[model samples]
Target: ASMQKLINSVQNYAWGSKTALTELYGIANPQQQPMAELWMGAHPKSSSRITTNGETVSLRDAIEKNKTAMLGEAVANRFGELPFLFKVLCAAQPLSIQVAPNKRNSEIGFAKENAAGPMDAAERNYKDPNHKPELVFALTPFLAMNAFREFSDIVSLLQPVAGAHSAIAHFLQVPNAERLSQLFASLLNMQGEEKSRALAVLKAALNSQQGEPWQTIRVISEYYPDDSGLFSPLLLNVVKLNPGEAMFLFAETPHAYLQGVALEVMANSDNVLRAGLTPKYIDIPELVANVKFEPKPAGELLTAPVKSGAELDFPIPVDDFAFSLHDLALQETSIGQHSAAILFCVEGEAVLRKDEQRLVLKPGESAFIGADESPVNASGTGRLARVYNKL
Candidate 1:
């Protein structure tokens, strides 16, 4: 049985919270820098570290040394490496309105951009040749905009401000789901005097508006004034996930995280195409080309987990990762390992035992258990989150 403790990496993005990570995980930040994400996987950009035989090495390097033993024969044959990236994301400000390409599009986009310029170029879009389908489980009340709203709902929300701009007026003429891409493109590409005039009218309309989409719009405008994404709350379905609730983000869907902290897991890729609500490079045409233009009901945005005893298993469509939560008590809970797994302690402490080996985990601590370590015996008092490959 191979079970190793892991030391993860923390990312400090501008939109991160100054206190969340420190409070939740006891991560130190004497400089008070914004701590955005705590990554706990073997993605090359920021792989977690593990110690073996008195030597510390990256998890990626360890996996490379013995893929079969580390990832299991089936997982190694299927993905060739760790296929998922796990993270704790704390967003104090709204992230950019963005969409990730599907597998085919990502492969094409990555190769095309590779030929154009350096990989780190400011205008570069695709970061890897893999599709990113993610699931976010809220640790706090998480607010976000996911997919598109019904065509008629979008039209109704924009009706009051349609006379403010030609683009809005044009969108109202058709207001069909098929025209969503065109409308989104037109709004993002608006320039000069036209853009200024539309924003002015939108601000005026929002000043008197009350509740939900309007409130969210006003909040976004405070951070990104004059951005076309200020209309996102109306154009997309706004959903809030209370603690323990989770949602899936499919490839080619436009989505944005608005606020609060969450645990996110996705296929190991960093490719993103952004349109607005960010100072990052914006590629309007690329974003429009990749976004799937179907309307998704706000009610359908959340994923309900299957509850069995003390475990809550979130069923996701993708094969890259599986996430589940466990409530531990004094009695030993047997957790069968299907593949390489990472067990995280979220509250209280947990004692993980396999054969003669044992590891104790406190809150925010995690351990990597190999597939060979089947049926890990877990006991103590806390909430444990398990991340592993889906069979």
Candidate 2:
């Protein structure tokens, strides 16, 4: 068979929504446990399941069995395995403010950490040696903080409460990337009295403020009281992406998903260096070193998808993965299947066809099409999200 229906995996993180997955895709949660993410790719940790020769098998094993058939020769030669992971991420609560290492740093860090302790250790920083650059398409109103705000904007946001706290006062002294970096480092490293005083001052000023950074500050405080990351909304560019809007998270960038549901596609890696808003281990110095302390303007936060025929392609900067949306309304449309691809139905129903074979995908369901199955066509009323390698 050229295409196989995938039984994806669900990750139940603490910050997940109890009802979002159930409401959107009819995914069951009788226990009402938080459904953080629905993973739909051949990741090593939780690879999607598929049927072959009337037997169930993991996508990872299937790919490993016939790399040239599952992944194209080009992709197989380039990446050795699946290069990307597709996920439906539902964040009911804010995720940790974190940064991912660049390719070189990731390799170095992964090796160093591997030599020090077990892979499952709580303090482990690196999960793999590959850099993770992600693109998220909003399924709902998605609120997040990405990169840094302009130096002047950060100073202005902090000015109101600066006099009440020593750290803010020092952070206000200079309005450049260097000072921004220093301030971030100081905040992450702040201890006992200094951290408490800063949080108190920021909390006290909450009554005077009316919008954005202040609003987000209050939200973060509720989830993570006294954590220095509560002030992140003031330091970072706060973006709210409505349904259909998309954002690209580049490697080395500081970011956090604050709320709502989205479809996220990224290179197959788990490396994350956390800053704060997490109970997980935070390697402050490693996070500081990995983050790119530059401003990302609000206008530049969302990645505009380029429309071509029935598909809207998100032009990301990496070669590991390409993401696109297709609307299969009334007519059949040929999917851009350059390599192995995963087609996920987000709404309604879609019928996928390749030669004599056919596969029907309902909402919340997905199918993995081998690279050999090129020129596949789809028709129906569903909206489809396609994930494949650029090759």
Candidate 3:
């Protein structure tokens, strides 16, 4: 147990200037600095740049320049390869509806993008190495969709809601799921006349929804004014994240994070193929190509349950990554110190001490602890979330 005594310290933040400001609780706390968000592990692309003696240096550059011994040795070994990258995700705006492909798609998309030369193309694919199998648990009353809707569900929804006014009627009889999916992508690509036509019909459904979904839609309508995610009840599934509840996304699945404070973690990749419900670059062809079609109920891909501490094993089969969570109440609990791990607090307050370093990561804050230090001790008065990957 003594061997498990871990080492941890507040590392520097690296990527914020290029990232989105995660607005939590309907408030905007914009992170406008260079890389002040955080970059842990060996992903090299953008590691948090630690400030020492008024000098600016990157974690990666330090790790490399240090040669044999690195500044984060104790921290790195205790946690390992940043087992999971953690994030305090917030949304005052709608994000792009996107899907991450599996390993095979990763290779193909990467090769194609590499061939494109510029690296940052309008159609950038394979932004990172990992397949980006991900899970996001809500820290507040959250909202979003996490899987591709089955064509049948779409067709069922289209008739009454989008039928009379939009493209749903034009492609109503589309036979193959693949064909229907292409048409679905078209709803996002339509510009000028087509965009207006599709949105008007969608708005009609938005105005007409009754019951629980309608009530939520009205709230969304107030904030967004004319956002597509508001019509999500009719066009896409609506998931409400009670505190601590989470949804997982495997490769090839579609999801859009609409609202709330969420603790997000994913394999070390940034690659994403977007569909719709966002203002970012919309790659209709790629999104259509990568989509996996099936009829979907309103809620799918939801994580069943996880115990208070330790790890939560998912059903998906993949060794590269896995996600387990730990929620500790008043009493202190023990956790694994092997391999690598990422720890964050979803709600409440807690003190995580290890590696001669203590991190006061409150809700919307986090830290990376390497497993090389054995079992790490985390005890707090509130709720805490721990995500780690093993061999």
Candidate 4:
């Protein structure tokens, strides 16, 4: 009986698209800062506001006060907090070339860094000792490079620049995954003028548009001209996700969002080890240690969400969270209470009812459905996405 609406917070990052969030959420950006993400969760960084009877409190405070009612006994006991963070990401420019460490690596790295320096230190890679495995459902046409490409495809892509960039061409000529790893190691290990020299040659070759994924490469290179990771498209598979399509990135899977908007969900952690393609901190050595060098085959871009009844479930490998998208036309569907959940309406209007507590959601409006004994039934016409820990 504790279902209530939420007032979420928006993060303004430079890479975010200007018009996407403003138009969708009906919020005016007077300062014109790029609206990067709309975060709906109970993280200390920017927790959502939950208001009742003229009293407003942070979602984190409410969860702490009544953990069992807000996050369920199972989730509350295990995570002791909200396990997932939901977001609407608008990437106008390419994100950094990065990969998250697995749970074991995260714990180890976090402890090591904590012992070495302050938590707020610029060199610290791990924020919390939790792995961040994420799944993104596309709201608009999206492009990204997710895992390394197969050996054969790697050689084929390098062929265009091989003659022009002798070093890269020489390294990739052997045509093997082992050699590919070595070549990548060499590239990522370079320093000062040496790295700049190598990047310039590869940049020229990519700008030539004489390769398979050079089309995608050209787009990223323009955004990050100096970053050596801009050449990542050659080694990684350039994946595309159309509307309704989805993709999941496992821990240590190297990836970067190149463009467009998507509904993203992940564990409640902010630890990121980045190598390049960003102005922020880039720890090449740490990234090299954490990145998985395996190649992902082509024709494996979109992750098809499983559909049943009113829900389309995008399953991931973690118990931290699961995403289910509901597109209701006329029929009503019930969102059963199992654990804590955050529901956001993406299109049209929707009505949610749980006994006497009722709330109507329009496009971009969201609600935090507190965990309880009774189930909340939703009936309306629109598209909605919800996240919960699949306990």
Query: lDDT: which candidate is best?
Result: 2
Q: Provide the lDDT at 228 for model 2.
A: 82
What overall lDDT goes with each candidate model? 0.85, 0.87, 0.57, 0.80
TM-score of model 4 vs. true structure: 0.94
Clashing pairs in 2: none
Residues 1-391, candidate 4: write the lDDT tens digits: 3676888888888778788988766778888888999888987989999887689899999999999988898999899999988889997788887788999999999899878777776788999899998888888888887888887788777776664344576666576655766666666666687777777777777656664477777788778777767667888888878888888887787888888888999887788787668667666677777877777776665666788988888877788888888877666688875798898998888888887778899888889887873467788887888898788
lDDT of 1 by residue, 310-364 (tens): 8899998988888999989999898875688899888889999888888999877
Scored by lDDT, model 4 comes in at: 0.80
Q: How should the candidates be ordered by TM-score, best one leading?
A: 2, 1, 4, 3
Instruction: Name the lDDT value of residue 195 in candidate 1.
Output: 82
Candidate scoring better on lDDT of 3 and 4:
4
Model 3, residue 197: displacement in angstroms? 1.9
For candidate 3, write residues 1-391 as lDDT tens digits: 1121112222234422223333331223354433222333445654554444567565456445642233234435543344345555545444556788887878888887777665676767677545777777776677877664556666666665554344456556663566556556656666676556555665666566565555655655565444444444444566788876777776666777766556666766777677655557776677767777654565555777645434454433454455666665555566664454556555566667665755565554555444444456667655555655555
Query: How many pairs collide in each candidate, listed in order?
Result: 0, 0, 20, 0
Residue lDDT tens for model 2, 1-391: 8779998999998878999999998999999999999999888779999997589899999999999988999899999998999999997888888787889999999998878777877778888899998998999999998999988889899898786456667778867777788788888777798888888888988999999889988888888996888878889999989999999998788899998999999897877688889767677778888888888888888998899889989998989999998989777999957799999998989999988999999888999988988768999996998999877
**Model 1 steric clash pairs:** none
What TM-score would each prediction reach against the true structure? 0.96, 0.96, 0.74, 0.94
What are the runs in model 4 whose C-alpha is more than 4 Å off? 163-167, 210-212
